[PDB]
Design a binder for this molecule. Structure first.
Ligand SMILES: Nc1ccn([C@@H]2O[C@H](COP(=O)(O)OP(=O)(O)OP(=O)(O)O)[C@@H](O)[C@H]2O)c(=O)n1
Ligand SMILES: Nc1ccn([C@@H]2O[C@H](COP(=O)(O)OP(=O)(O)OP(=O)(O)O)[C@@H](O)[C@H]2O)c(=O)n1
Lengths: 126, 126
């Protein structure tokens, strides 16, 4: 079984998020999404409209998502790859090159973001 | 096959929408969701943040949803029930009694809304 992992907040779920999940899932057989907890968001001074419990709840109903785990800090990535036996690590290309140190443990793939949509723009346009 | 139908806008998808979809699906084997088109929304003077195409796209990825059709006007309900061979019609209880005339064609069920969450509150709190 080829396991894939990706990290993010997924606060006001939009089509850009969906396209990412779609493409990440097609890189394996099982997709795990690690999402920022509310404590971690506070550390990043990036408050999410929806709580961790609600963001997880909604993510768990998306066809592409197999499992959702909490992202509590910046450092947990290497152990997650080990703990969950991850074969593919996927991130948006705005992180291009940042996680190349994980390549000795799994395949690292940077997918281009979907243009014209993001959670802050939604908030700014409201 | 017991088919279910429900109508709505499903603009900024939240846990209240998810719980409705979950409960509606458990009333049958197949769930069809009719969502307001942007033209109908203009007619209702209730503009959605996300377009019809993006609202449909996101709804189609929810595990509970089997099919998504366009809701173009207020009068289409009886023909939809005929056209899609609907057995169960589900609406929020805030519509309790408004569609009781469809009872000679199928079962009509009003489910209680989820408290503390709605698309306007999200918009108001942003
Ligand atoms: N238009 C977009 C928006 C997000 N993503 C991807 O979604 C994943 C995580 O989602 P998130 O960061 O929560 O969405 P954003 O809209 O980028 O959130 P924000 O605008 O608040 O930074 C990232 O891999 C990001 O590249 C994407 O591919 N295309
Ligand atoms: N907290 C909520 C919000 C919506 N719904 C149900 O979702 C369906 C349609 O969703 P929608 O009306 O688009 O969501 P709202 O949050 O009610 O959007 P708005 O505040 O603009 O009316 C309705 O049958 C409604 O009862 C619900 O059960 N609980």
């Amino acid at each position: 079984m080829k396991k894939v992992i990706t990290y993010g907040t997924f606060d006001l779920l939009h089509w850009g998020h969906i396209k990412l999940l779609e493409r990440a899932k097609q890189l394996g057989d099982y997709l795990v999404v690690a999402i920022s907890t509310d404590e971690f968001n506070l550390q990043k001074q990036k408050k999410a409209y929806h709580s961790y419990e609600h963001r997880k709840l909604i993510l768990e109903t998306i066809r592409y998502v197999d499992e959702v785990i909490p992202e509590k800090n910046w450092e947990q990535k290497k152990q997650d790859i080990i703990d969950h036996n991850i074969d593919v690590f996927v991130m948006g290309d705005d992180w291009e090159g940042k996680f190349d140190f994980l390549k000795d443990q799994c395949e690292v793939v940077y997918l281009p973001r979907t243009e014209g949509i993001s959670t802050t723009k939604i908030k700014e346009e409201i």
